[PDB]
């Protein structure tokens, strides 16, 4: 596998050039600053430190390098996070998987990978670049992540038997999914064995009593959702009609000399409306943008109501622990909080949900609300048995920075450490990669 994408700029100029252009999509928006409530709901987990909205594929490697979530490893065995964090960021992951094998790849801390995983998300992620057919300009789409191949099988869709159009969406489905870390090596695995609906994955995580972390306010064993667009897309009316991710996000387009190719500048479809929705819809651009924005507002409105409930629940649960509640007394409440938050998180962890499957988004939040209702109703009784009967009062969480101080984060300290790491360690990584010829000189 060839991870150095430049290698391919000469044979495949139109793709290389449009691919490279995702660097223009560089706005990196602080999702926590926008919704400080998230810091409470993720108390005790790295997402409470740093969580931004997605940007261009071109920023993948640098963004995982720079999140507060990966911390500031002193050495190849240090740092909070495992090798698996590289998995969906670079074609060097494919290199390493074929070089050291999967287990070899997953072994160790993220930091171990720093001077190995250096090329931007690119050609060998989606393409079997080895094939002689690829130089000839045929796609030769492939799944380069074996854990993604397994999952497509688990879901009844073995890649190599799927038709061309299913395969298009599956390449995106290598990374744009909900996943968890499986086993002591912490390998990536999509929780799809029982299906891809919220309640499927819920029972699945429960069969194996898995938790991503324990919320540090309520002591609840939490599950974390991550960007489930593949699951959520297939549930939506476009996916039911086999409108693929490529149909909206990678439209066929023309050379300055009318040669047709696929736009690799993967971004917002509305930017190229004539070449995307317009292919299948007669409504004009402003009409369709308007509909989409209404679904975004609806979901956001309900989204915040659920989040407000969960903020009350985590702090009520803390008030109960402080009042001497025992584990047996907390366990049913924690079950409800775990379930409520999982449904909420999965509902909105994809920033596309209002477009891909707005009605599933709304449905998940409704069922999140049902569990949050139970959680807080059980807490009001529990606290009563402890002699407390007033409303539990929440610290000021009107800003990201207040919410972070409120759950005990030393943000200056944390940012200082990260800034020191970025400034000094990353350039060491790139110099090592150059010497080893992993990175273009």
User: Quick one: which segment of 225-233, 305-313, 391-399, 413-421 binds ligand HEC (CB under 6 A)?
Assistant: 225-233
Q: Are 347 and 361 in contact (CB under 8 A)?
A: yes
Binds 224: which of its own copies, ligand HEC, Ca ion, none (CB < 5-8 Å by kind) = Ca ion
Measured distance CA(378)–CA(340) in Å, rounded:
14
Q: Give the list of residues 6+ apart from residue 384 with CB closer than 8 angstroms, or none.
A: none
Q: Decide whether 63 or 329 has the Cβ nearer to Ca ion.
A: 63
Does 21 engage in binding with ligand HEC (CB under 6 A)? no
| Adjacent-strand bridge partners of 221 | 214
Measured distance CA(89)–CA(83) in Å, rounded:
11
Site residues for ligand HEC, 343-382, by CB under 6 A, read 351-352, 355-356, 358
Q: Decide whether 281 or 331 has the Cβ nearer to ligand HEC.
A: 281
Which three-class secondary structure state does DSSP give residue 226? Answer: coil
Which three-class secondary structure state does DSSP give residue 126? Answer: helix
Residues in the chain: 441
Measured distance CA(246)–CA(265) in Å, rounded:
11
Query: Is 290 marked as a binding-site residue?
Result: no
At its nearest, how many Å lie between Ca ion and the CB of residue 351?
7
User: For its own copies, what does the binding mask look like between residues 196 and 235, x meaning CB under 8 A?
Assistant: ----------------------------------------
At its nearest, how many Å lie between its own copies and the CB of residue 378?
8
Among residues 439, 441, 428, which one has the least CA distance to residue 65? 428
At its nearest, how many Å lie between its own copies and the CB of residue 299?
8
Q: Residue 297 — φ and ψ, nearest 5°?
A: -70, -40
Pair of tokens at residue 326: 């025992």
User: Quick one: which segment of 95-103, 132-140, 250-258, 389-397 binds its own copies (CB under 8 A)?
Assistant: 389-397
User: Quick one: which segment of 65-73, 200-208, 314-322, 408-416 binds ligand HEC (CB under 6 A)?
Assistant: 65-73
Query: Is 312 marked as a binding-site residue?
Result: no
Site residues for its own copies, 251-310, by CB under 8 A, read 283, 291, 295, 298, 301-302, 305-306, 309
Measured distance CA(48)–CA(402) in Å, rounded:
12
Could you tell me the maximum CA-CA distance found in the chain, to the nearest angstrom? Answer: 78
Q: Decide whether 325 or 353 has the Cβ nearer to ligand HEC.
A: 353
Q: Decide whether 175 or 333 has the Cβ nearer to ligand HEC.
A: 175
- Among 49, 109, 112, 127, which residue sits at the site for ligand HEC (rule: CB under 6 A)? 127
User: For Ca ion, what does the binding mask look like between residues 42 and 61, x meaning CB under 5 A?
Assistant: -----------xx-------
Q: What is the DSSP string of 361-385?
A: HHHHHHHHHHHHHHHHHHHHHHHHH
Q: How many angstroms from the chain centroid is the CA of residue 393?
A: 32
Q: How many angstroms from the chain centroid is the CA of residue 234?
A: 17
Cite the annotated binding site for Ca(2+) by residue number: 178-179, 224, 226
Interface with its own copies (CB under 8 A)? 237, 240-241, 283, 291, 295, 298, 301-302, 305-306, 309, 358-359, 362-363, 365-367, 369-370, 372-373, 376-377, 380-381, 383-385, 389-391
């Amino acid at each position: 596998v060839e991870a150095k994408n430049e290698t391919f700029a000469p044979q495949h100029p139109d793709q290389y050039l449009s691919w490279k252009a995702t660097s223009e999509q560089s706005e990196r928006v602080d999702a926590l600053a926008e919704d400080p409530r998230l810091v409470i709901l993720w108390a005790g987990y790295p997402f409470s430190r740093d969580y931004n909205k997605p940007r261009g594929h071109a920023f993948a490697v640098t963004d995982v390098r720079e999140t507060l979530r990966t911390g500031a490893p002193k050495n190849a065995e240090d740092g909070p996070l495992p090798m698996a964090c590289w998995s969906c960021k670079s074609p060097d992951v494919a290199r390493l998987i074929q070089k050291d094998g999967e287990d070899g790849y997953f072994h160790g801390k993220w930091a171990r990978g720093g001077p190995e995983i250096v090329n931007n998300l690119g050609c060998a992620d989606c393409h079997n670049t080895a094939s002689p057919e690829f130089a000839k300009g045929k796609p030769e789409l492939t799944l380069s992540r074996p854990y993604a191949a397994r999952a497509m099988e688990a879901i009844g869709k073995p890649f190599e038997k799927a038709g061309r159009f299913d395969q298009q969406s599956m390449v995106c489905g290598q990374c744009h999914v909900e996943y968890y870390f499986d086993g002591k090596n912490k390998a990536v695995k999509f929780p799809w064995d029982d299906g891809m609906k919220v309640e499927n994955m819920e029972q699945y995580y429960d069969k194996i009593a898995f938790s991503d972390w324990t919320n540090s306010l309520s002591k609840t064993p939490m599950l974390k959702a991550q960007h489930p667009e593949y699951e959520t897309w297939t549930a939506g009316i476009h996916g039911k009609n086999n409108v693929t991710c490529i149909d909206c996000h990678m439209p066929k387009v023309q050379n300055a000399e009318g040669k047709l190719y696929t736009d690799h500048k993967i971004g917002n479809p509305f930017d190229n409306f004539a070449q995307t929705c317009a292919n299948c819809h007669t409504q004009d651009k402003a009409a369709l943008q308007k509909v989409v924005a209404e679904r975004k507002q609806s979901i956001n409105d309900l989204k915040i109501k659920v989040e407000d409930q969960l903020v009350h629940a985590h702090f009520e649960a803390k008030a109960a622990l402080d009042a001497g509640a025992t584990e047996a007394e907390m366990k049913p409440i924690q079950d409800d909080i775990r379930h409520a938050q999982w449904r909420w998180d999965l509902a909105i962890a994809s920033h596309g949900i209002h477009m891909h499957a707005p009605e599933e988004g709304l449905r998940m939040l409704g069922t999140a609300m049902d569990k949050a209702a139970d959680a807080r109703t059980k807490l009001a009784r529990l606290l009563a048995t402890k002699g407390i009967t007033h409303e539990i009062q929440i610290p000021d969480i009107s800003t990201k920075e207040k919410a972070q101080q409120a759950i005990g984060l030393n943000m200056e300290q944390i940012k200082a450490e990260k800034q020191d790491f970025i400034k000094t360690v990353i350039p060491q990584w790139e110099e090592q990669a150059r010497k080893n010829g992993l990175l273009s000189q």
